[PDB]
């Protein structure tokens, strides 16, 4: 891509309102002027400090979004002013996974809902990993739902920055310490994040949620793998969490291996779950 040849978004796209009020920063519910179809628009300022980082988010989202579990790239635009870069993509109108769990009774999702959502996350990750892309910011806030209960991944912003985000979904290997100065990691760091996301769906919050983020950052590399608090869950669900949450990434399974895990592989009530999720989205709307 080249920032020079990009057109002005006037009469093509318009901003409606910010989405998630700061969760994603300068991200808006947008509208394709001519059709009225919604789009999510990421608005970044084209500063010299953040100009190469800005181009890279365009290029990545552009080539790696042609998969049903990743929100699709539409186009890039520059609104000349300090110039404003607009990154336009597919709008997912039913909120994030975090929203879904906080707007549910008892801040807990049914196990078969967790199995459905976790598989869609892993299918999106398998697409990224096969194209040598690590998502790097897997969390319930970056996993969105559409009106018809489809699950899509967002944010190539930190994909492989001046502000470090939330640390709760971060794998031990991405947190630098004395025996890990270079914070050496691979695609498996997203699988740990997927495991924390499944705990988040089961409990309504990631482990260490009650800690100061800086304290969680210190604790993640030294604490044993997090575990589900309740004993109610199936053996397969406990086994899936254990798979995602292997402390040492060197023996953590691959995305392909986790997709074959009985909890992810065996979903007999798939059809009903999709209907239940749709019903939940409609009853919240
Ligand atoms: N596609 C979306 N539809 C609805 N709401 C959203 C909220 C955030 C992001 C988001 C967050 C961070 N970086 C992005 F590129 C997009 N994308 C969407
Ligand atoms: Mg797509």
Q: Where in the chain is the domain with CATH 3.30.200.20?
A: 1-91
Token pair, residue 159, equals 């994909």
Pick from 174, 162, 117, 161: nearest CA to 142: 117
Counting ligands in written order, the one closest to the CA of 94 is 1
| Sequence-ordered list of residues with C-beta below 8 angstroms from that of 190, at least 6 positions apart, any chain | 125, 128, 129, 134, 135, 136, 138, 255
Q: Are 3 and 73 in contact (CB under 8 A)?
A: no
Residue 25 region, left (φ>0) first, then alpha (ψ -120 to 50), else beta? Answer: left
Strands 73-79 and 38-45: unpaired
Token pair, residue 210, equals 């009650």
> What is the best residue among 31, 71, 158 to mutate for testing ligand 1's pocket, by most ligand atoms within 8 Å of CB?
71
Ligand 2 centroid vs 265 CA: distance in angstroms? Answer: 22
Token pair, residue 44, equals 């970044």
We find that the CATH architecture of domain 1-91 is 2-Layer Sandwich (3.30)
Backbone discontinuities in the chain, residue before each (C to N > 2.5 A): 81, 160
Token pair, residue 134, equals 């690590």
91 CB within 6 A, ligand 1 = yes
Residue 236 backbone dihedrals phi, psi, to 5 degrees? -60, -40
Q: Domain 92-285 carries which CATH code?
A: 1.10.510.10
Pick from 236, 241, 146: nearest CA to 198: 241
The whole-angstrom separation of Cα 14 and Cα 9 is: 7
Pick from 38, 40, 30: nearest CA to 10: 30
The whole-angstrom separation of Cα 258 and Cα 260 is: 5
The whole-angstrom separation of Cα 45 and Cα 162 is: 14
Token pair, residue 173, equals 């290997």
Axis crossing angle, helix 270-284 with helix 111-130, rounded to the nearest 10: 100
Ligand 1, atom 15, residue with closest C-alpha: 155
The whole-angstrom separation of Cα 151 and Cα 270 is: 13
The whole-angstrom separation of Cα 198 and Cα 139 is: 9
**Three-state SS letters, the chain:** CCCCCCCCCCCCEEEEEECCCCCCCCEEEEEECCCCCEEEEEEEECCCCCCHHHHHHHHHHHHHCCCCCECCEEEEEEECCCCEEEEEEECCCCCEHHHHHHCCHHHCCCHHHHHHHHHHHHHHHHHHHHCCCCCCCCCHHHEEECCCCCEEECCCCCCCCCCCCCCCCCCHHHCCECCECCCCCCCCHHHHHHHHHHHHHHHCCCCCCCCCHHHHHHHCCCCCCCCCCCCCCCHHHHHHHHHHCCCCHHHCCCHHHHHCCHHHHCCCCHHHHHHHHHHHHHHHC
Ligand 2 centroid vs 1 CA: distance in angstroms? Answer: 19
Token pair, residue 199, equals 């705990």
The whole-angstrom separation of Cα 199 and Cα 132 is: 26
85 CB within 6 A, ligand 1 = no
20 is annotated as contributing to ligand binding: yes
Ligand 2 centroid vs 219 CA: distance in angstroms? Answer: 36
Q: Are 147 and 93 in contact (CB under 8 A)?
A: yes
Token pair, residue 108, equals 């807990």
End-to-end Cα spacing for the chain:
38
23 is annotated as contributing to ligand binding: yes
Going 98 to 37 to 151 to 22, the CA torsion angle's sign is negative
2, 45, 137, 186: the active-site residue = 137
The whole-angstrom separation of Cα 64 and Cα 56 is: 12
273 CB within 6 A, ligand 1 = no
Residue where the block lists tokens 């953590």? 252
Is 186 known to be catalytic? no
Token pair, residue 64, equals 């790696």
Ligand 2 centroid vs 66 CA: distance in angstroms? Answer: 5
Instruction: Name beta bridge partners: 200.
Output: none
Token pair, residue 61, equals 């989202």
Pick from 117, 152, 157: nearest CA to 133: 157
Residue 141 backbone dihedrals phi, psi, to 5 degrees? -75, -25
111 CB within 6 A, ligand 1 = no
157 CB within 6 A, ligand 1 = yes
The whole-angstrom separation of Cα 261 and Cα 158 is: 28
Instruction: Name beta bridge partners: 31.
Output: 14, 38
Q: Where in the chain is the domain with CATH 1.10.510.10?
A: 92-285
The whole-angstrom separation of Cα 105 and Cα 97 is: 14
Exp. method? X-ray
Pick from 151, 91, 154, 148: nearest CA to 115: 151
């Amino acid at each position: 891509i080249d920032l020079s040849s990009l057109r002005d978004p006037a009469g093509i796209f318009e901003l409606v309102e910010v989405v998630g009020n700061g969760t994603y920063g300068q991200v808006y519910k947008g509208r394709h002027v001519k059709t009225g179809q919604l789009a999510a628009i990421k608005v970044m300022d084209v500063t010299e400090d953040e100009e190469e980082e800005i181009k890279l988010e365009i290029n990545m989202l552009k080539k790696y979004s042609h998969h049903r579990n990743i929100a699709t790239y539409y186009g890039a635009f520059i609104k000349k002013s300090d110039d404003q870069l607009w990154l336009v993509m597919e709008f997912c109108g039913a909120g994030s996974i975090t929203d879904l769990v906080k707007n549910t009774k008892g801040n807990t999702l049914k196990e078969d809902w967790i199995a459905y959502i976790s598989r869609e996350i892993l299918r999106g990750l398998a697409h990224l990993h096969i194209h040598h892309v690590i998502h790097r910011d897997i969390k319930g806030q970056n996993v969105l739902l559409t009106e018809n209960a489809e699950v899509k991944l967002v944010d190539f912003g930190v994909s492989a920055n001046t502000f470090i985000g939330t640390p709760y979904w971060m794998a031990p290997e991405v947190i630098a310490c004395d025996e890990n100065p270079d914070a050496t990691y691979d695609y498996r760091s997203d699988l740990w994040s997927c495991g924390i996301t499944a705990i988040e769906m089961a409990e309504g919050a990631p482990p260490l949620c009650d800690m100061h983020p800086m304290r969680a950052l210190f604790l993640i590399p030294r604490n044993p793998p997090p575990r589900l608090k309740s004993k109610k869950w199936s053996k397969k669900f406990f086994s899936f969490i254990e798979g995602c949450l292997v402390k040492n990434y060197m023996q953590r399974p691959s995305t392909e291996q986790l997709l074959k895990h009985p909890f992810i592989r065996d979903q007999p009530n798939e059809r009903q779950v999709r209907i239940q999720l749709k019903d939940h989205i409609d009853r919240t709307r």
